[PDB]
Amino acid sequence: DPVAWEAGMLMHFILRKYKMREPIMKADMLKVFTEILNGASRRLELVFGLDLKTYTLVSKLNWDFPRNGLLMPLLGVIFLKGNSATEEEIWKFMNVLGAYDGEEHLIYGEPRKFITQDLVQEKYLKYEQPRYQFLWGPRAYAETTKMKVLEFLAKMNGATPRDFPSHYEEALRDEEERAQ
Amino acid sequence: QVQLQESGGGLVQPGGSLRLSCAASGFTFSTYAMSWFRQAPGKGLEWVASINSSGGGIQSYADSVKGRFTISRDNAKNTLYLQMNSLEPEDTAVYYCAAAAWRVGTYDYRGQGTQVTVSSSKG
């Protein structure tokens, strides 16, 4: 699937251009199609909250916890693999975002310290065991739902929550349990 | 339009109790998960507690407060409550009330806060 990887590289390029005080025009990223730029735009709009793809980027927040933008994706993949994800699967997910162990990510910083310490200290995640796995934290259970995280998890690599039968059923049951 | 108004702060002797309230207007209160944060003198913002929407049956607390603070909500009054028992001087801080955003890990609205000072008049 070279075109998804192409959109990912274009997204990395647009992120580098956005963080630094550098402009972003179509001809600039042409040499470095419409499906690929639309994919880069969807990735920027969902993972980082960057709307427009000469272009002009407009953001959403990013009392600002920009790195916490990573949280709902993670809570998604954990919910995708039942309710607990292997650390290897988590790192595989972090890779397509461009975040690598011991690497200073452009926005997240070093990802291991952020996801096994910060998000754990904040009760958003749990990181337990010589193999480790990630699970939802109590803050996650309190501040979002299985249905909202399923909506997010489907919005990328999917379309609707109904495409996941068992997951949509579990989110319905979770909504019924919460209403009590 | 939207407003979160915190109230109930003041001086309190250690080991005593205090109820903080947060009145919410301009949005559907019952829809948002709510949180209490606090900022101590010369320290950063610290998450205190969180409670879910749609029944409020899921509470979460920081370890510093787990056995002593109690978050609750009245949807009919659009009000959030933080009950603080067995208070300690560490609990001296400005306390803020904040509505959790749909993108979990961020927040849409926050109040102006109320000051809670835990100190003894003689001790």
Residue among B52, B57, B105 whose CB faces A71 most closely: B105
- The C-alpha atoms of residue B94 and residue B92 are separated, in whole angstroms, by 7
In whole angstroms, what is the distance from residue B115 CA to residue B72 CA? 19
Report whether B104 contacts A143 (CB < 8 A): yes
Other CB atoms within 10 Å distance of the CB of residue A98: 18
**Strand residues in chain B grouped as ranges (E):** 3-7, 11-12, 18-25, 34-39, 45-51, 59-61, 69-74, 79-84, 93-100, 107-110, 114-118
Strands of chain A, DSSP E: 85-86, 125-128, 133-136
CA dihedral A71→A72→A73→A77, nearest 10 degrees, is 100
Nearest to B60 by CA among B49, B70, B52, B68: B49
- Asked if the Cβ–Cβ distance from B105 to A69 is below 8 Å, we say yes
Give the range of the structural domain holding residue A93, as residue numbers without chain letter: 66-179
- CA-to-CA distance for B8 and B18, rounded, in angstroms? 8
Q: Do B105 and A123 touch (CB under 8 A)?
A: no
The packing angle between helices A146-155 and A71-80, to 10°, is 100
Indicate the residue of B53, B61, B105 with minimum beta-carbon distance to A68: B105
CA distance A127 to A119: 9
β-pairing, B18-25 with B3-7? antiparallel
Distance separating alpha carbons of residues B63 and A121, to the nearest angstrom: 9
* CATH at A106: 1.10.10.1210
In this structure, what is the dihedral angle of CA atoms A169, A171, A176, A179, given to the nearest 10 degrees? -170
Check: CB of residue A50 under 8 Å from CB of residue A44. yes
| DSSP H stretches of helix in A20-144 | 26-31, 34-47, 71-80, 87-96, 111-113, 119-121, 138-143
d(Cα B46, Cα B49) in Å, to the nearest integer?
Answer: 9
Contact A76, A152 (CB under 8 A): yes
